[PDB]
Structure 1
Amino acid sequence: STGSATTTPIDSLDDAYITPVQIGTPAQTLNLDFDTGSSDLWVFSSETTASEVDGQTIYTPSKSTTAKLLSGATWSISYGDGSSSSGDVYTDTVSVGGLTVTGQAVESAKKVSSSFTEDSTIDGLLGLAFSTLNTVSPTQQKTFFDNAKASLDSPVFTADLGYHAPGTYNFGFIDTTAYTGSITYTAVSTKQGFWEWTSTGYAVGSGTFKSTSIDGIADTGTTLLYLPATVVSAYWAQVSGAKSSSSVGGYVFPCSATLPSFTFGVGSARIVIPGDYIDFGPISTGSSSCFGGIQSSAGIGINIFGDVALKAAFVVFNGATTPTLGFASK
């Protein structure tokens, strides 16, 4: 079997991507944020505290004839961005672009933090990292990908995020018309439960490529590109007037600048992120200072190849016996 769904940026800056997901019987369609950096499928629901819901579509388990309450199971998650959510668990039929999983754990939110409430376009998350990070207690649950894997024509899912435009998440197959050249596969460590790999280096604009190992995670759930302070300082030093602002919480640059591109290595191959992809608009409405798309990971503890980097490539999340990541230009 296979699945294919369109993913769309929630706003003019590509702050996040939403993909329609069918849950329950009859189908309840919610727009979820596909997250390769987490492993919980959670939704805003009829049980979420009323004051914590503002515009989101909710899952009502009581209206689903296939929903079964998972006895005594609870979930609670805290993300790297300080956001959190928690609640109870149901098992239900979940479909992504024609691909169906029966008995998927659907984590119904009883509580969400303000960051989730203020994002009216995001009805919940769909975790695509390894099932070892799933927060369901006392019995850990599997991801949608993990549940569908055996049935898939090939044990893979692909992320093809668009820049200011719709994209695609495919399950079970590789669309050879969706990229140029070849896909370069690279080793993955699943020890931290992430699609963790090692980039072979970088280049800023037309500059000389620096061969250096950068360990990081392929994370569709993170908007920006988080890299070591040395690399990020080398990038912003090419932008006239750019500086790291402690009040804003990162590198900012004059909105009138044309940004240089950023290249990252995947083995001997290179993925070029165009400069416009690194522009995240005014720091505040009407400001002439803009927020940078490449930020230091010094406060995080891990490098994150978020949407800024992933949207420049066709990305294969290969869930074979030994998982690997594949990258191609497009």
Structure 2
Amino acid sequence: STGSATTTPIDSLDDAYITPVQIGTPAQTLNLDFDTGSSDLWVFSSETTASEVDGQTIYTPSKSTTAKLLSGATWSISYGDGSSSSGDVYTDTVSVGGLTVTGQAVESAKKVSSSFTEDSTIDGLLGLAFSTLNTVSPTQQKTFFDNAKASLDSPVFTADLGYHAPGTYNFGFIDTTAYTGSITYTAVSTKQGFWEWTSTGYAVGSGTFKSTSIDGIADTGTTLLYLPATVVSAYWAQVSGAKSSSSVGGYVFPCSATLPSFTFGVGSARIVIPGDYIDFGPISTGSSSCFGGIQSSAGIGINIFGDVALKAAFVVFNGATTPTLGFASK
């Protein structure tokens, strides 16, 4: 089997991407944030504290003839940005782009933190990291991809995120029309539960490529590109007036600037992030200070190849017995 679903930016800055997901019988369609940096499929629901729902579409398990309470199961997740959610668990039929999994754990939120309430466009998360990170207790549950993978024509999914435009998540096949050149594959460590790999270096604009190993994770659920402070300083030094602002929480730059590109290495191959992808717009409405799309990972403990990087590539998440990642230009 295969599936193919369009993923759409939630706003004009590509702050996140939402993909429609059918849950239950009859189908209830929710727009979920596909997140290769976490491993829980959780949704706003009829159980979510009413004051914490503000415009999201909710899953109502009592209206689904295939929903079953997973007795005694609870879940609770805290993400790196300090956001969180928790609740109980149903199993139900879940379909993405024509690919159907029966018995998928659907984690129903009883509580969500403020930043989830405030994103009216995101009805929940669909985790695509490794199932070892799933938070369901006392019986850990599998991701949608892990449940689907035996049925898939090939045990892979691909992320093809657009810059200020829709893109595609495919399951079970690699669309050879969706990229240019060849896909370069690179090793993955699953030891932390992430799609963790080692980039071979970077270049800033037209500058020379610096060969240096940068371990990090391919995380569709993170907006920006978080890299070591040395790398990020070298990037922003090429932008007149750019500075790190403690009050804003990262590098800012004059909105009048034209940003240089940023290249990252995948083996001997190179992915070029155009400068415009690194512009996240005014720090506040009407400001002439703009927020940068490349930020330091120094306070995080891990480097993160988020959407800023991934959207410049066609990315293969290969879930074979030994997982690997593949990157192609497009």
Output the TM-score relative to the length of structure 1.
1.00
1:207-233 CA distance string (max 9 Å, x none): 000000000000000000000000000
1:245-289 per-position Cα deviation (integer Å, ceiling 9, x unaligned): 000000000000000000000000000000000000000000000
- Partner Cα distance (1:210, 1:75) in 2: 43
What is the CA–CA distance in structure 2 between the aligned matches of 1:249 and 1:295, rounded to whole Å? 9
Q: May I ask how many residue pairs the two structures share in their alignment?
A: 330
Residue 315 of structure 1 deviates from its aligned partner by 0.1
Q: Deviations over 1:269-328 (max 9, x none)?
A: 000000000000000000000000000000000000000000000000000000000000
Determine the C-alpha separation between the residues in 2 that align with 1:11 and 1:247.
Answer: 24
Note the residue ranges of structure 2 that are not aligned, 5 or more in a row.
none
Whole-angstrom distance in 1 between the partners of 2:95 and 2:78: 26
Question: Alpha-carbon deviations, 1:169-225, whole Å to 9, x = none?
Answer: 000000000000000000000000000000000000000000000000000000000
- C-alpha separation between the residues in 1 aligned to 2:277 and 2:88? 38
Give the Cα separation in 1 of the matches to 2:98 and 2:296: 39
In 2, Cα distance between equivalents of 1:288 and 1:227: 25
Equivalent-residue separation in structure 2 for 1:256 and 1:95 (angstroms): 44
* 1:93-113 CA distance string (max 9 Å, x none): 000000000000000000000
Cα deviation code 1:109-161 (max 9, x no counterpart):
00000000000000000000000000000000000000000000000000000
Structure-2 separation of matches of 1:212 and 1:26? 52
Q: Distance in 2 between matches of 1:252 and 1:86?
A: 34
Question: 1:202 maps to what in 2?
Answer: 202
Look up the SS of the partner of 2:73 in the other structure: strand
* Over 6 Å off, 4+ runs: none
Write the distance in 2 (CA, Å) between the matches of 1:174 and 1:122.
Answer: 27
After TM superposition, give the deviation of residue 58 of structure 1 in Å. 0.1
Deviation at 1:50, TM superposition (A): 0.4
Please give the alpha-carbon distance, in whole angstroms, between the structure 2 residues aligned to 1:82 and 1:219.
Answer: 17
State the SS of the aligned residue for 1:147: helix
**Residue 328 in structure 1 maps to residue 328 in structure 2:** yes
Report the Cα distance in structure 2 between the residues aligned to 1:266 and 1:8, rounded to whole angstroms: 26
Measure how far apart 1:5 and its partner are.
0.0
User: How far, CA to CA, are the matches of 1:82 and 1:165 in structure 2?
Assistant: 28
Question: How many Å separate the matches in 1 of 2:21 and 2:272?
Answer: 31
Shift of 1:73: 0.1
The 5 Å alignment of 1:301-320 reads 301-320=301-320
- Give the 5 Å matches for 1:153-168: 153-168=153-168
Determine the structure 1 residue equivalent to 2:279: 279
